[PDB]
Amino acid sequence: YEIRWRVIESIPDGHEYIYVDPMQLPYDSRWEFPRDGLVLGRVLGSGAFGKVVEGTAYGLSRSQPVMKVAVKMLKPTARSSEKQALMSELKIMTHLGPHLNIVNLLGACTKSGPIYIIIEYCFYGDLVNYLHKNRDSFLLTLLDLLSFTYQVARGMEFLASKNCVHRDLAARNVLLAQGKIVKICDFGLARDIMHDSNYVSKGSTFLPVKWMAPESIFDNLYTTLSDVWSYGILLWEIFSLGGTPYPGMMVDSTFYNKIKSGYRMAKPDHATSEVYEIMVKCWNSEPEKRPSFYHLSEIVENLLPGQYKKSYEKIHLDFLK
Ligand SMILES: Cn1cc(-c2cc3c(N4CCN(c5ncc([C@@](C)(N)c6ccc(F)cc6)cn5)CC4)ncnn3c2)cn1
């Protein structure tokens, strides 16, 4: 190809070194959970082709013989396109490993019918409804907002270390667990970073434009660095207490023109000067200049009381006992 500026730089030293593709890896049978040990209850989120329901699981844990869970599944209206994606989503989760700030996978029903993905249940729901619920009380506290901001930073650091690009980081995809523990969810659009080069076929039809970095919209480039842009948008959501990004702006020619020119959202009412600067660094137009998720945690860690780090580590270690 003759136009070299349109070729993205591609990174393998010798034939001995291969990319471990999680899509190609075997399914550990220990994830399997009999379908007749799962009762399905109320819907937790739904869409045209799928839903997440609350479930009770009997005998999934030795600690909790009757345990509340969530269950990701497809509707009858879903086609084979949605069926292959849910499978690949299960593949990404079985190989990620567990983390304190991820809605962890507990099991799956893969053997007979449609796929069920069984995930831990988060008592408080998503961060957008939670922040709407508490708006009047705030005016929750400010430290809570910082704590949410740190935990997502650690969650994302864990994902990027596994070379996993989330591609839909947003407040609607942050849940709150029993001890005000923040959990990232929805790996439907998640891809390994080497996925787009090795098995090239994509075409998600509807995208979260207002959360996406310029090079993701315009060039279909998804990296950890475009996740960091989304993390900036997530921060704006949290400190506007559940606000809609770019409020009053339709996504159109002029919107894309504005973002490309350097337009950015103004500071939200409940963000400090220092916290707005984090969102600004996150929306740098040159992706390589955005801060890393490790660096972001270190910045946000400074904004929290000194003991928080020690207590957060105590929760974290305990979770993996
Ligand atoms: C009021 N309240 C609510 C909760 C709550 C809510 C969750 C939860 N979520 C629910 C939202 N999610 C979600 N919704 C839709 C999709 C789809 C439509 N795109 C989809 C579904 C299936 C499919 F195969 C493909 C696509 C995906 N995911 C998951 C996270 N998970 C755990 N606990 N929990 C607890 C608690 N109080």
Numbering used by the authors: 555 to 565, 567 to 694, 790 to 971
Sentences from the paper on this structure:
Avapritinib is the only potent and selective inhibitor approved for the treatment of D842V-mutant gastrointestinal stromal tumors (GIST), the most common primary mutation of the platelet-derived growth factor receptor α (PDGFRA). Furthermore, we report the identification of a sub-pocket (Gα-pocket) located in the N-lobe of the kinase domain, which is surrounded by amino acids of key regulatory elements such as the Gly-rich loop and the αC-helix.
The complex crystal structure of avapritinib bound to PDGFRA-T674I demonstrated, as anticipated by Grunewald et al., that avapritinib binds an active-like kinase conformation, which is characterized by an extended AL and a DFG-in state as was evident from Asp836 (or Asp810 in KIT) of the Asp-Phe-Gly (DFG) motif pointing into the ATP-binding site. Avapritinib interacts with the hinge region via H-bonding with the backbone amine of Cys677 via the pyrrolotriazine scaffold N2 nitrogen. The solvent-exposed methyl pyrazole undergoes a cation-π-interaction with Arg597. The linking piperazine forms contacts with Val607 and Cys835, while the pyrimidine interacts with Val607 and forms an additional hydrogen bond with the catalytic Lys627. For the primary amine located at the stereocenter, we observed an ionic interaction between the primary amine and Asp836 from the DFG motif. The binding of avapritinib stabilizes the DFG-in conformation of the kinase domain in which the amino acids Gly605 and Val607 of the Gly-rich loop, Leu641 of the αC-helix, the catalytic Lys627 and Leu629 form a hydrophobic pocket that can perfectly accommodate the shape of the fluorobenzene moiety of the inhibitor.
